[PDB]
From Swiss-Prot, chain B:
GO terms for cellular component: centrosome; cytosolic small ribosomal subunit; nucleus; small-subunit processome. It comes from Bos taurus (Bovine). The modification N6-acetyllysine is found at K70. This is Small ribosomal subunit protein eS7. Belongs to the eukaryotic ribosomal protein eS7 family.
From Swiss-Prot, chain C:
This is Small ribosomal subunit protein uS15. PANTHER family: RIBOSOMAL PROTEIN S15P/S13E, SMALL RIBOSOMAL SUBUNIT PROTEIN US15. The modification Phosphotyrosine is found at Y37. Ubiquitinated at Lys-26 by RNF14 and RNF25 in response to ribosome collisions (ribosome stalling). InterPro entries: Ribosomal_uS15, Ribosomal_uS15_arc_euk, Ribosomal_uS15_N, uS15_NS1_RNA-bd_sf. The modification Phosphoserine is found at S29. Keywords: Acetylation, Cytoplasm, Isopeptide bond, Nucleus, Phosphoprotein, Ribonucleoprotein, Ribosomal protein, Ubl conjugation. GO terms for biological process: translation. There is a cross-link at K26 (Glycyl lysine isopeptide (Lys-Gly) (interchain with G-Cter in ubiquitin)). The keyword Nucleus applies. Belongs to the universal ribosomal protein uS15 family.
Swiss-Prot record, chain E:
The modification N6-succinyllysine is found at K87. One of its GO terms (molecular function) is structural constituent of ribosome. Its main location: cytoplasm. Keywords: Cytoplasm, Nucleus, Ribonucleoprotein, Ribosomal protein. InterPro entries: Ribosomal_uS8 (IPR000630), Ribosomal_uS8_CS (IPR047863), Ribosomal_uS8_sf (IPR035987). Coiled coil: none annotated. Belongs to the universal ribosomal protein uS8 family. Pfam families: Ribosomal_S8 (PF00410). The lineage of its organism: Eukaryota, Metazoa, Chordata, Craniata, Vertebrata. GO terms for cellular component: cytosolic ribosome; nucleolus; ribonucleoprotein complex. The gene is RPS15A. This is Small ribosomal subunit protein uS8. GO terms for biological process: translation. The keyword Magnesium does not apply. It comes from Oryctolagus cuniculus. Component of the 40S ribosomal subunit. Part of the small subunit (SSU) processome, composed of more than 70 proteins and the RNA chaperone small nucleolar RNA (snoRNA) U3.
Curated annotation (Swiss-Prot), chain F:
A zinc finger (C4-type) spans 36-58. Its main location: cytoplasm. PANTHER family: 40S RIBOSOMAL PROTEIN S27. The keyword Phosphoprotein applies. It comes from Oryctolagus cuniculus. It is found in: Cytoplasm; Nucleus, Nucleolus. This is Small ribosomal subunit protein eS27.
Length: 83, 189, 150, 208, 129, 83
RNA sequence: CUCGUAGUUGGAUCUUGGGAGCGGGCGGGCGCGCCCGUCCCCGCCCCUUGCCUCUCGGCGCCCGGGCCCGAAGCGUUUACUU
């Protein structure tokens, strides 16, 4: 960040990926910060709030992205079902 | 007041003596004759058990905890009656054997067997506070930077005995050892 | 590790983490000490003494029933053996190997096992030298090959 | 997803889920599908989790509705086994369809005719759309896909656990996904069962 | 023989880390690598962790986090004469803004800043980032 | 990232695994509290007895050691965990 | 291609173990006290981790003695850091 005296460490905050607790670089393409609609849960209808998911780009090739966003959604509490 | 109801091994003589009077009243019956006449505690110190309560701890001279439980089972089941509202369980009294590798003296014997160190005595402490239910696991957890927690797992078919006494163990362990332990009951194969 | 064998497999044991007393047939310390003394008395080896004590009585560890173990309590009795297990078993297979070679001299690739035999007994001999269950000098040049062999 | 048991498990799904054959995927398994199974036969096939199926399917609906303005998302195959389904899903949804034949570079080549700017990629199957899936990894647009026990699962962000081989199961999936997505949109307030029946999405050699 | 469970920890964690698993299990352990775990925590690179008890080796499960790059193990085991400390800082670890070389010496475990603060040096075994 | 619960993963995996790599390594052996049929007493053996214990009730043998196990010809009471 | 002397090396563990410990030095809510900080860092400590046993005596402190001292740290040892 920009500290008070100028301990300048960030020129800005790059989009951090939380799906694996890892940071990415400037030039990526699979680090996708998709949006997800929030429900009202009086009918299950969409309403105006965001559940977001931005995974580090490289994991998509391994095809873990489905699993990681499964974990993310379960934790986020828009998905509660568990067998 | 301590003939063979309390063999003498230390300085104070206060509550263990009344406990011993209870013991000599117990040993009149057909399950404690000459079995509660010999393995009688020597010291006893008052501490808490959980919140809103208190209890008494018994220090045997402790050459005995091998064959001590074979009367301590009857001792709990038939002296929790006459000192109810508190708890009793056998302990291994160790002052401590101090560290061998620090030495300048001669009246401190020259080689240490492990059974007197800080760690072996500590597993002896865990045995002490739960004899009848065996330990079936120990996962050690770290608190907030390096502080200690010890999850310890016990036999499923041995909960029938110490479940209203579930916090009592970790209550005593805090003074005896110094850290926080919990006792869960896992899946069995 | 693992020089003297090219295979790496291990299947030895992993005793129950629960150091508790076995408790299937308890068969407490008295008859256990009697059987341990009997087994050592009649001329048996700790490796098979333990096998018998696990078979008939049933033991996972003698240290569990009694703090002193077989070697310890024999050493406190007086029944220490001639030579220990690792020197003796390799000696009594060496006798067979050398019998083989000098009966079929052409077996050029069993001299390659004889040599590892003097090597294994040599390693364990200079080990048991410091263990001091053997004299400060203990000489095997295949001159000790049959001194104990009748 | 959701804590509404009405969107969640109901007989309204199973009465057709068991009818199609939604509780069987295929013989073998890739190492990225274990999340979505509960039992195994003695007969050589794995019977998928339809509950987890509806779970990630409702997450799929969540993604489809987070499309703030529908004109800008592609639903694609190139295999006729789902060409009809994608056509009739896009026709009623509004987001654009591509099926049958694709052209690499449409949303990858900077200069292109039919240079289309999607914002989400829907594919019938990764084994069915080789190149478009790679191009979806090329441009920053998320990927939604069906998933079998057999199927390779690479670059899949939104997974729908079900067999995708068969017209009957895949038609059930499109036909109930449409209702689910519009449900969470809120145009369907649990007023009706939807009058379209799954024979509509079981692919046809059209002679009618 | 099998050797240097410290080195084997610093290789197994980096084996699993670039593969991204949230926690990790390592077969062997020691009180001293436990002590590295704790020094790591005081900076927060790792989270809390569990010490699975099997008297045979002692296994460790520890969480990996995006707070880390790697930590090295140095056999042979040197000594920092407190002249060479700045040298080792400037030539091993990538940053003076994080990461601080590790020392076992006569004042407890420590990393190099806290070592310099107590004015006592010793062996290098670790350096992290 | 296909990370499994490492403080406590699923049970069956540990049993199906080799005993020597377990979360805590415990044997694949049990103990045999058998009858040795044909007599009114009950006696026990090591459940993989590589040295036989004679079955003098039916006038036969009790334990044929077969590989990494002791297989019984005539013997009644198999007993599971006791410790 | 095997063995093997020196050859350089090496499992785990034999305290990184508790207190509200105190004065003092601190990160910190509070205004170094309560404290979160495995005794946050030591003189004084407390469960332990070494010694006055020996002379005359230092504020002690009791009644030539003794809990600590001294000239001084004499009950294994080395490596290595200040």
């Amino acid at each position: 960040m920009q500290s008070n005296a100028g301990e300048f460490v960030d020129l800005y905050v790059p989009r951090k990926c939380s799906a694996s607790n890892r940071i990415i670089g400037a030039k990526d393409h699979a680090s996708i910060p998709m949006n997800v609609a929030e429900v009202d849960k009086v009918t299950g209808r969409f309403n105006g709030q965001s559940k977001t998911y931005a995974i580090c780009g490289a994991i998509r090739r391994m095809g873990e992205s489905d699993d990681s966003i499964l974990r993310l959604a379960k934790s986020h509490g828009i998905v509660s079902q568990n067998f | 007041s301590a003939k063979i109801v309390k063999p003498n091994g230390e300085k104070p003589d206060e509550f263990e003596s009344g406990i011993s009077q209870a013991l000599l009243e117990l040993e009149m019956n057909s399950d404690l004759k000459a079995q509660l006449r010999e393995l009688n505690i020597t010291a006893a110190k008052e501490i808490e058990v959980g919140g809103g309560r208190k209890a008494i701890i018994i220090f045997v001279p402790v050459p005995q905890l091998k064959s001590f439980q074979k009367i301590q089972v009857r001792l709990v089941r038939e002296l929790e009656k006459k000192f109810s509202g508190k708890h009793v369980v056998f302990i291994a009294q160790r002052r401590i054997l101090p560290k061998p590798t620090r030495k300048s003296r001669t009246k401190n014997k020259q080689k240490r067997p492990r059974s007197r160190t800080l760690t072996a005595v500590h597993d002896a402490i865990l045995e002490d506070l739960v004899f009848p239910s065996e330990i079936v696991g120990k996962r050690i957890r770290v608190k907030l930077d390096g502080s200690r927690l010890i999850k310890v797992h016990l036999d499923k078919a041995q909960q029938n005995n110490v479940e209203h006494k579930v916090e009592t163990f970790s209550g005593v362990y805090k003074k005896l050892t110094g850290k926080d332990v919990n006792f869960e009951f896992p899946e069995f194969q | 590790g693992r020089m003297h064998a090219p295979g790496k497999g291990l299947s030895q044991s992993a005793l129950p983490y629960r150091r508790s007393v076995p408790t299937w047939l308890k068969l407490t310390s008295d008859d256990v000490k009697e059987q341990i003394y009997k087994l050592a008395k009649k001329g048996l080896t700790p490796s098979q003494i333990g096998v018998i004590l696990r078979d008939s009585h049933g033991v996972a560890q003698v240290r569990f029933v009694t703090g002193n173990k077989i070697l310890r309590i024999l050493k406190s009795k007086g029944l220490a053996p001639d030579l220990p297990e690792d020197l003796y078993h390799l000696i009594k297979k060496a006798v067979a190997v050398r019998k083989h070679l000098e009966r079929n001299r052409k077996d050029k690739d069993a001299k390659f096992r004889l040599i590892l035999i003097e090597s294994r007994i040599h390693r364990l001999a200079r080990y048991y030298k410091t263990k001091r269950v053997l004299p400060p000098n203990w000489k095997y040049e295949s001159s000790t090959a049959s001194a104990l062999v009748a | 997803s959701g804590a509404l048991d009405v969107l969640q498990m109901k007989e309204e799904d199973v009465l057709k889920f068991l009818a199609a054959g939604t509780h069987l995927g295929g013989t073998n398994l890739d190492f990225q599908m274990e999340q979505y199974i509960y039992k195994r036969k003695s007969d050589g096939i794995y019977i998928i989790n339809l509950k987890r199926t509806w779970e990630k399917l409702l997450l799929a609906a969540r993604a489809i509705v987070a499309i703030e303005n529908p004109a800008d998302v592609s639903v694609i195959s190139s295999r006729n086994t789902g060409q009809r389904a994608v056509l009739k899903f896009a026709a009623a949804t509004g987001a654009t369809p591509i099926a049958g034949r694709f052209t690499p570079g449409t949303f990858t080549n900077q200069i292109q005719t039919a240079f289309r700017e999607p914002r989400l990629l829907v594919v019938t199957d990764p084994r069915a759309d080789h190149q478009p899936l790679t191009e979806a990894s090329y441009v920053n647009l998320p990927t939604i896909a069906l998933c079998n026990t057999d199927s390779p699962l690479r670059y899949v962000d939104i997974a729908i656990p079900c067999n995708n081989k068969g017209a009957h199961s895949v038609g059930l999936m499109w036909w109930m996904l449409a209702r689910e997505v519009l449900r969470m949109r809120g145009t369907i307030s649990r007023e009706h069962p939807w009058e379209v029946m799954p024979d509509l999405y079981f692919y046809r050699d059209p002679e009618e | 023989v099998r050797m240097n469970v410290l080195a084997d920890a610093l290789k197994s964690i980096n084996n699993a880390e670039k593969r991204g698993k949230r926690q990790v299990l390592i077969r062997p352990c020691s009180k001293v690598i436990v002590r590295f775990l704790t020094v790591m925590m005081k900076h927060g690179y790792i989270g809390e962790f569990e010490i699975i008890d099997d008297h045979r080796a002692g296994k460790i499960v520890v969480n990996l986090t995006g707070r880390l790059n790697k930590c090295g193990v140095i056999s042979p085991r040197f000594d920092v004469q407190l002249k060479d400390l700045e040298k080792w800082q400037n030539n091993l670890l990538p940053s003076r803004q994080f990461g601080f070389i590790v020392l076992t010496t006569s004042a407890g475990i420590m990393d190099h800043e806290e070592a310099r603060r107590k004015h006592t040096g010793g062996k290098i075994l670790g350096f992290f980032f | 990232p296909l990370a499994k619960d490492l403080l406590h993963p699923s049970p069956e995996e540990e049993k199906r695994k080799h005993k020597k790599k377990r979360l805590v390594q415990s044997p694949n052996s049990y103990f045999m509290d058998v009858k040795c049929p044909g007599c009114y007493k009950i006696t026990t053996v090591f459940s993989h007895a590589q040295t036989v214990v004679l079955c003098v009730g039916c006038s036969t043998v009790l334990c044929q050691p077969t590989g990494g196990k002791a297989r019984l010809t005539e013997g009644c009471s198999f007993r599971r965990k006791q410790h």
